[PDB]
Amino acid sequence: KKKGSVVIVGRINLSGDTAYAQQTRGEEGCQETSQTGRDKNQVEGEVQIVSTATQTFLATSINGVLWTVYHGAGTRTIASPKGPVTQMYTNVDKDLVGWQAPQGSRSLTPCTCGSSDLYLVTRHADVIPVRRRGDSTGSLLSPRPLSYLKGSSGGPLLCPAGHAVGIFRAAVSTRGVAKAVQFIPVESLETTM
Ligand SMILES: CC[C@@H]1C[C@]1(NC(=O)[C@@H]1C[C@@H]2CN1C(=O)[C@H](C(C)(C)C)NC(=O)OCC(C)(C)CCCCc1cccc3c1CN(C3)C(=O)O2)C(=O)NS(=O)(=O)C1CC1
Numbered sequence: 364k365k366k367g368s369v370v371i372v373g374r375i376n377l378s379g380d381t382a383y384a385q386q387t388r389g390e391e392g393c394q395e396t397s398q399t400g401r402d403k404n405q406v407e408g409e410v411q412i413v414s415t416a417t418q419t420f421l422a423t424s425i426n427g428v429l430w431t432v433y434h435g436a437g438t439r440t441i442a443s444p445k446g447p448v449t450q451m452y453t454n455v456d457k458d459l460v461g462w463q464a465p466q467g468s469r470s471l472t473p474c475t476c477g478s479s480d481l482y483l484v485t486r487h488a489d490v491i492p493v494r495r496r497g498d499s500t501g502s503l504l505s506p507r508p509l510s511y512l513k514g515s516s517g518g519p520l521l522c523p524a525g526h527a528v529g530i531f532r533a534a535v536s537t538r539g540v541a542k543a544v545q546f547i548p549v550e551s552l553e554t555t556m
Pocket residue numbers: 418419420421432434435436455456457458509512513514515516531532533534535536545
């Protein structure tokens with residue numbers, strides 16, 4: 364047996380004045396696309412909603428690279444119009460993986476603002492205010508149950524300008540309440556690159 368490819372099943376629309384999620388592919392289609400690695404669907408935007416046979420999470424475009432977490436993706440190839448695409452970046456120590464950004468997608472610019480007022484984008488297209496607390500952490504202004512954040516790993520942390528500050532990695536949870544988030548800083552990405 365072989366593991367399937369990661370498959371783009373949707374995206375987070377941040378184009379207009381309203382953030383909302385869009386599904387671009389259903390479950391049977393996903394199942395098939397994962398097996399073949401052949402995905403002919405048009406890709407749009409910065410924030411992709413992705414899937415394996417077993418898990419669903421997010422993937423983010425930064426500097427022409429579609430980024431996600433190792434815990435979600437493993438070493439899996441990504442489904443594309445011309446077949447499975449091998450990872451160009453793999454880092455288990457950082458819970459980080461990357462593939463060449465798919466044609467049609469748009470990439471976010473790495474932040475150079477040195478600013479601590481951030482915004483987390485969830486799988487549900489919720490825009491969550493986060494205050495930066497260190498190189499890798501940030502507190503939620505309004506804490507949420509873990510449930511609310513689940514499946515958002517691989518999504519972005521944005522600055523007020525819209526620059527990418529980082530990739531959501533793990534939640535800081537106490538007795539099911541998430542008071543903070545842990546992320547992969549964009550500098551780590553730039554370094555990997
Ligand atoms: C539910 C929303 C969570 C965002 C999310 N991530 C996770 O679920 C990750 C996956 C796993 C656990 N975890 C946690 O968030 C846990 C938690 C809440 C489950 C209890 N937090 C924790 O241990 O904090 C503790 C903390 C000290 C802050 C960790 C810092 C170091 C973190 C770290 C550094 C380097 C490597 C690795 C890690 C952590 N890491 C590998 C790893 O494999 O973590 C997700 O949404 N996942 S998902 O559902 O989309 C999945 C399908 C893809």
